[PDB]
Design a protein around this nucleic acid. Structure first.
Ligand SMILES: [Mg+2]
Ligand SMILES: [Mg+2]
Lengths: 121, 55, 114, 104, 98, 67
RNA sequence: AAGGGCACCACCAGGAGUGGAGCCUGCGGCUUAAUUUGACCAACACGGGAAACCUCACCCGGCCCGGACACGGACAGGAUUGACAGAUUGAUAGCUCUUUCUCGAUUCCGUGGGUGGUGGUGCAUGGCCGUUCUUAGUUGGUGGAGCGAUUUGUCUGGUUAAUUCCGAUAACGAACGAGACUCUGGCAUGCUAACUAGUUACGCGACCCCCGAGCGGUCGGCGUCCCCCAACUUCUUAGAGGGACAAGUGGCGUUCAGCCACCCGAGAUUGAGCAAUAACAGGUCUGUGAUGCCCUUAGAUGUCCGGGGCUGCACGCGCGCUACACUGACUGGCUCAGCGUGUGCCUACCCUACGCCGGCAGGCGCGGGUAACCCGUUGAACCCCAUUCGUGAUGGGGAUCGGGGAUUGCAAUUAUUCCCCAUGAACGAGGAAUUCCCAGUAAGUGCGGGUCAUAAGCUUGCGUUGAUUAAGUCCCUGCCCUUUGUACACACCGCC
């Protein structure tokens, strides 16, 4: 439940009234025109989901654009998000709606602090 | 590539949109009074434009 | 008005034009004993006066090179046609022009002189 | 037309502006037009501050430059027409002039 | 350079109609300022003039961000017999009012 | 270096012989066996492609698909 | 080692601090595919270096040649180029593949030869600039001396900020630097001018007293350069000039050079800029179509495109900001600035009055301004006057963090910025050490400009408020001149 309505209503929740359910940043993003790359990615995920076998997850789809905002019609896809080095496949959970795709493929590994070198004498 | 991606990335603003009018440098530009000249080039030519030292 | 820029920007643009023209004359008339540039602008038209030693050398066959430079300055800065004239002036006491003497020294060094 | 015009002069130095503002009005008096007094506008000082070094290593010494733009306003007013009377500008290089009218 | 004929002759006749031509250094300029109607990219004219300099029919002068190509005497007859022109039509710099 | 991918194979063209994709019969009868591009920018001189499921114009870049 | 003089990048007497806390920012270290790199008084809010893309030079991948010219093959019976579909691709890169159309001599191949590179080399270099050193010192000719390296000139002394000058004098005659010089601030009721600056007077007005004044008080309300329909330049502007010279008086002084006190004066030392010889293996080849040599140059170290990073954290350090509060905080009212900017060749991107909507950040239409014409009389902060708070980690502090709302952009996640409501952490004046400073000075305080599509904790300036202490010294840290010792000369960070 993103904003109190279920996912089923979100599937047929058109863009014009969906912006009143997103936050301010996402609403401004959707107010501005989505470019052709995002539409092509949406068509690709739709193609993968329709060609996906029943009761089985779809195939992986890769992309560099991690500034995509998550839409409810992309739930359940296998999306591989670039981290700068490789593509990181990630689930779309029913709780990830207002979050950008880049938040789920970290751009660095967390540091394991070692013995300090010559510095900090 | 073809023309669709060779210069597709916009440079209608920002630091990469501006270069020195002499040496085309992208650092230390002087946009004041539309001078559009590099800091080094301005020190080189300020006598020629007419910016002279008083104090 | 709206077409014309402010006075400060206009003086800045004039200085830019002066510096660019000086650089062009330096890099073009280096072997012709270039000394300096003097420009006289009027609302009617502009007059550009080059100070140099070898006027007969900067002037091509029947003024060919002076015509070439006049066309170059016509094209690059986009003046109205026929509104610019180029005069080549012989300097007085060329030993007093540090630019000419330095260029002559560079010519001597390029000749192979110690 | 019956004409009342405005003449403005500006440059980077004061000697040339002063000699133009002197000889032009003297010629106007010899050519018997009454002249509105010369108005010296406050000077525009264009200041640019720049580090002397081209690298950044040093003692952080800033080189400051100036450009003093002085402009003078002189209004030539005659009972009869003006432009057919005075046409010679007598302008040396280095000083800018703009000739407008009361309507402009 | 893969640039076609139809702009090559246009650039050539611009270069012959007057003794010089001026081109800013910008390989990404959508359109060279003069010869506006021909829709010729600036990179094509830059490389055409570079090839002409390489063959020696034009000499090049470089200010801050501009080229100042000067057509030479070996550039006269080459443009003449490339454009199929009798030796009577001259560039404007060569002969004026005479 | 040591690029993980092999060097990408650049396309080499097919080296087509003389075109000859039009035939006349019994002492001369024109037979357009290739599609016409109807646009002005294509013209009536050039022919269109003969793909197995569409037609392509070399200049007009239109696509006529037959189902 | 001695003698003399000098400096808040030294001290004294003080002031404000830093170092103690949080945060911003830059170095090191750690981690990383990558955290690009230089720099270690004279690096560490520096490279005008406040990077989402670009910047980018780092990494992960994908294109193009933007490989001229010459030679030889190749070819109009096709050298070769673009491309719809599908797969393939992050990609709607015809990049590759299946598939055919299409350009036509511009290309393709190979051989030399270009070319380019924020690639390397500042210990090859130019230029720039920093430092030695902003101290007062430096040199030629001729002459004197010494075999000569060299020395005199360039000094015993007195004086100065100053080898500044007076004085002696084997020196004389010079030259640079200092000085002189330019800008700046301070006085000019002296001159010129002012509708793009004002003032005064007057006429319309508007409001209060109107008891009764009435040439009463206020107006940044309207007008008198609308052309006959007022004068004036003090206030403002900016030009020409003047004005200050140790000039006058007393004292000290070889009564010379100068020094102290004082009257009159606006001012009896306004701050800056420039700034000698010689030098550094000081920094920049990442400013340059400044550049030598070397490396690469088609699977590119070129170039373009996509993304990430340059911010990444057990930690150390530098410059800053915020504070630790009652000399305060909050709320309301009252009241004064000055620099300086504002719509663009590429280049799109301006300052904004006023009206309306919204609580705010913002949005919606009318204008002005290319500018002493508009923002703007820049109604700034500090401060002042009144309210509340009450010595508590408290109404100080706002770090961290949740949610929501707008702005810019192609894109705001690793939060651009802003706004609102939430949480209130350390911090109760900071060890050893250490920075800067003598009058509109420190410090408090805000405002412009730079960077800016969006932006300042930085910086350059500007203004407001505004001091304590001192008119000395060499004690430390150093410097100049003379003498002296030296076994040093890469010069005591020496040599041994
Ligand atoms: Mg409170
Ligand atoms: Mg001894």
């Amino acid at each position: 439940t993103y904003r109190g309505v279920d996912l089923d209503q979100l599937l047929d929740m058109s863009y014009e009234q969906l912006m009143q359910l997103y936050s301010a940043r996402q609403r401004r993003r959707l107010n501005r025109g989505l470019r052709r790359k995002q539409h092509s990615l949406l068509k690709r995920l739709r193609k993968a989901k329709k060609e996906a076998p029943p009761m089985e997850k779809p195939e992986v789809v890769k992309t560099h654009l991690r500034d995509m905002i998550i839409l409810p019609e992309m739930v359940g896809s296998m999306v591989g998000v670039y981290n700068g080095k490789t593509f990181n496949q990630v689930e779309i959970k029913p709780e990830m709606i207002g979050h950008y795709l880049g938040e789920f493929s970290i751009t660095y590994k967390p540091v394991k602090h070692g013995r300090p070198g010559i510095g900090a004498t | 590539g073809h023309q669709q991606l060779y210069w597709s990335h916009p440079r209608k603003f920002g630091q990469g949109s501006r270069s020195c009018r002499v040496c085309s440098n992208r650092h230390g530009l002087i946009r004041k009074y539309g001078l559009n000249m590099c800091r080094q080039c301005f020190r080189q030519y300020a006598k020629d434009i007419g910016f002279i030292k008083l104090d | 008005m709206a077409v014309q820029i402010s006075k400060k920007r206009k003086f800045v643009a004039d200085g830019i034009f002066k510096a660019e023209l000086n650089e062009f004359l330096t890099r073009e008339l280096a072997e012709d004993g270039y000394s300096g540039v003097e420009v006289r602008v009027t609302p009617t038209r502009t007059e550009i006066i080059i100070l140099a030693t070898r006027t007969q050398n900067v002037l091509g066959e029947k003024g060919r090179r002076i015509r070439e430079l006049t066309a170059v300055v016509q094209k690059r800065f986009g003046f109205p046609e026929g509104s610019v004239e180029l005069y080549a002036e012989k300097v007085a006491t060329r030993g007093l022009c540090a630019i000419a003497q330095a260029e002559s020294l560079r010519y001597k060094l390029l000749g192979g002189l110690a | 037309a019956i004409h009342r015009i405005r003449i403005t002069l500006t440059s980077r130095n004061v000697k040339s502006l002063e000699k133009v503002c002197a000889d032009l009005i003297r010629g106007a008096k010899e050519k018997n037009l009454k002249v509105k007094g010369p108005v010296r506008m406050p000077t525009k000082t264009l200041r640019i501050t720049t580090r002397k070094t081209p690298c950044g290593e040093g003692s952080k010494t800033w080189d400051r430059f100036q450009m003093r733009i002085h402009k003078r306003l002189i209004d030539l007013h005659s009972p009869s027409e003006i432009v057919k009377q005075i046409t010679s500008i007598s302008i040396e290089p280095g000083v800018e002039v703009e000739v407008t009218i009361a309507d402009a | 350079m893969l640039m076609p004929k139809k702009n090559r002759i246009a650039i050539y006749e611009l270069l012959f109609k007057e003794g010089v031509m001026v081109a800013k250094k910008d390989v990404h300029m959508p359109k060279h300022p003069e010869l506006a109607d021909k829709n010729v990219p600036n990179l094509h004219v830059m490389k055409a003039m570079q090839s002409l300099k390489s063959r020696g029919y034009v000499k090049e002068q470089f200010a801050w961000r501009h080229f100042y190509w000067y057509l030479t005497n070996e550039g006269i007859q080459y443009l003449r017999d490339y454009l199929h022109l009798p030796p009577e039509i001259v560039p404007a710099t060569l002969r004026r009012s005479r | 270096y040591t690029t993980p991918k092999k060097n990408k194979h650049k396309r080499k063209k097919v080296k087509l012989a003389v075109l000859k994709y039009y035939k006349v019969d019994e002492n001369g009868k024109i037979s357009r066996l290739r599609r016409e591009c109807p646009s002005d920018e294509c013209g009536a001189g050039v022919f269109m492609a003969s793909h197995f499921d569409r037609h392509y114009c070399g200049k007009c870049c239109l696509t006529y698909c037959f189902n």
